[PDB]
Amino acid sequence: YEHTAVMPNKVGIPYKALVERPGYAPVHLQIQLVNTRIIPSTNLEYITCKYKTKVPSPVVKCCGATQCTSKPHPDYQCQVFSGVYPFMWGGAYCFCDTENTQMSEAYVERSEECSIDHAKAYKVHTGTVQAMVNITYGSVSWRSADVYVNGETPAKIGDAKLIIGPLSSAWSPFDNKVVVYGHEVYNYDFPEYGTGKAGSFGDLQSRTSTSNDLYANTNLKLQRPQAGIVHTPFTQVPSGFERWKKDKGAPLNDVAPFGCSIALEPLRAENCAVGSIPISIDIPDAAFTRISETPTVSDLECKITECTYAFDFGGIATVAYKSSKAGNCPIHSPSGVAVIKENDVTLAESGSFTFHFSTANIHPAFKLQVCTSAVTCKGDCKPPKDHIVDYPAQHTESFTSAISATAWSWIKVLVGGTSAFIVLGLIATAVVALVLFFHRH
Amino acid sequence: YVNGETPAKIGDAKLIIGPLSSAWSPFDNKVVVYGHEVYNYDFPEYGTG
Amino acid sequence: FTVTGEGLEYTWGNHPPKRVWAQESGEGNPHGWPHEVVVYYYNRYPLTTIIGLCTCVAIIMVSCVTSVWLLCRTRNLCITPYKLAPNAQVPILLALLCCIKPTRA
């Protein structure tokens, strides 16, 4: 048998339903989610890290000139200094006074730390959504396996067959371009591998962590070695990646709405709460017993003992019944006024049973069906003492969940009396018109 | 690279090829690649057949 | 930090995150006098019950000045076919019941 419905996109809140095969006893059904992961499709563009500029040994011609060509290196620099006359240990290095030449070339490359901490640049696209469901039905225990949230694919669990419907919202916390540095994820824009302004984010752009070609502009410039000392000095702007790690705001796993915890190894967005998920479950035909082998109850009267507003199961009710035989049959409230803590009861011949429920109304007007027989329950509820709890609400608050009986009496008085005060006015002009018409003849 | 940002050095010049005026692509959302020819085909999506 | 019924989470230092939700306690009492009813709904809704309070007195003011533009017009048609000719005997139903001005002469 196939049962279709719509479940909401909440994780810890179970969905309870009562399937009704004709000619057979009803079977309780319980679907619960564990995970909900949105997995966008990403492709790496470039990584970035702190640079490390190496300087080769300069050549010191004693008297002459040595020019350099152009080398295929990122941010390569050449500048020839004339007339240096350097000193080393053990006397002066050169002889030809006031006519000398120093090479002093410099070159920018990736640091050794770039294999460990590096920000990875991605663009995302819409990909797969998958979840993890928990299923029980009848007398079968809990079974769980991860499904795919597309209408087309079925995933069997136990002996059933579940088709989790598509999500009704295409919302995703990720932007078009993201930066994944270390543990956290940032919503950011890139200089698109061509540009980089030497001090913000893209002063070193490498397409792969082991790539050979490298882009780097760090405003490298060489300076004159002074006072006859053999060294190659240079001034350049500091690293933009080192600056970005100071001046970055909050990561996406602290800003994302709906409580989406962001994971990393497939770059997921776990456990969001938006929209609703349709369902369809193929219950096996061997789980349905014949209706004649079940108790038939009658003369049900339900009185709600104590009720309250609270997020947990704060309502207690008792049902007095009378049954033909002793057995088990599930209970379920089809309305949204209350949810039921219990799933089934053990019956006898003309006894009683009690159950726990949670609601948001002052006056609950729900009904529940036990042993394919229904009974209505009414009552009153009290405000709870607790101000803040640490668990989500089991129920769903509606638009008219706050209006009491006394507040609706003032709604009807303020509407009924003032509308009828115009009806008295409108019937007054239709009477004196009739009186003045009868004065005409 | 055809985007208005990345520059390329062709000899001693520097060319920045701008973005295309149309975002038209011949491929559909789902394609099938058999041999050396592509097809604009839909999918049974791994659960159906 | 203001916590609503949707929830709020906070991380302090290197501690794991903690989530808290706000219940619907309130301060007032809905089953009582009209000053007690409004106070309870003002704390629960501080954004909707100040509009519906102004709307309900806007409709009442409109409906009151609509009716007295029609009750006084009707009473102005009681007097104009009787006060013109004072010799006509005014019936006893129109003196007090149907319209307010009583008999004389």
CB contact under 8 A, C32 and A422: no
3-state secondary structure of A229: strand
Neighbours of chain C (3+ CB pairs under 8 A): A
A193/B47 Cβ within 8 A: no
Long-range contacts formed by A224-229: CB under 8 A, 24+ apart = A224/A81, A225/A81, A225/A84, A225/A86, A225/A102, A225/A104, A228/A84, A228/A85, A228/A86, A228/A87, A228/A92, A229/A86, A229/A87
Chain C residues in contact with A407 by the CB 8 A cut-off are: 30, 37, 41
B6–A148 CB contact, under 8 Å: no
**Side chain identity, residue A226:** Q
Nearest residue in A to C52, CA atom: A411
- Whether residue B47 and residue A154 make contact (CB cut-off 8 A), yes or no, is yes
Q: Is A400 on the interface with C (CB under 8 A)?
A: no
Closest CA to A239 of A120, A72, A106, A118: A118
- Whether residue A293 lies within 8 A of chain C, CB to CB, comes out as no
- Structural tokens at position A185: 């994820």
Task: Write a three-state SS string for C54-100.
Answer: HHHHHHHHHHHHHHHHHHHHHHHHHHCCCCCCCCCCCCHHHHHCCCC
What letter does residue A92 receive in the DSSP assignment? B
The backbone torsions φ and ψ at residue C22, rounded to the nearest 5 degrees and listed phi first, read -105, 130
The whole-angstrom distance between A415's CA and the closest CA on chain C is 9
For A388, the closest of C23, C30, C70 (CB atoms) is: C23
CB nearest to A150's CB, from B5, B6, B45: B45
List all residues 6 or more positions away from B9 whose beta carbon is below 8 Å from its beta carbon: none
- Whether A contacts C, i.e. 3 or more CB pairs less than 8 A apart, is yes
DSSP A125-161: EEEEEEEEEEEEETTEEEEEEEEE-SSS--B--TT--
Provide the resolution (angstroms).
4.8
Secondary structure letter of residue A29 according to DSSP:
E
Contacts of A327 (CB under 8 A, 6+ apart): A294, A295, A346, A347
Q: Which of A417, A433, A413, A432 is nearest to C64 (CA)?
A: A417
Reading the block at residue A7, the tokens are 């479940």
Distance CA C37, CA C56 (A): 15
CB A96 within 8 A of CB A60: no
Whole-angstrom distance, CA of residue A380 vs CA of residue A305: 9
Are A193 and B48 inside 8 Å of each other by CB? no
Search chain B and give the residue with CA nearest A126.
Answer: B29
In angstroms, what is the C-alpha Rg of chain B? 19
Q: Tell me the C-alpha distance between A397 and A385, whole Å.
A: 19
Tell me if A431 and C74 make a contact (CB, 8 A cut-off): yes
User: In A, which residues are within 8 Å of B3 by CB distance?
Assistant: 192, 194
* CA distances to A306, A322, A359, A365, A418 from A353, in Å: 15, 11, 20, 20, 48
Residue A198 burial (CB count, 10 A): 18
Q: Which residues, listed in sequence order, are joined to residue A202 by a DSSP beta bridge?
A: none
Whether A183 contacts chain C with CB within 8 A: no
Whether residues A153 and B48 touch (CB distance < 8 A) is answered with: yes
Cross-strand partners of A132: A35, A146
The token pair that represents A218 in the structure block: 């760090």
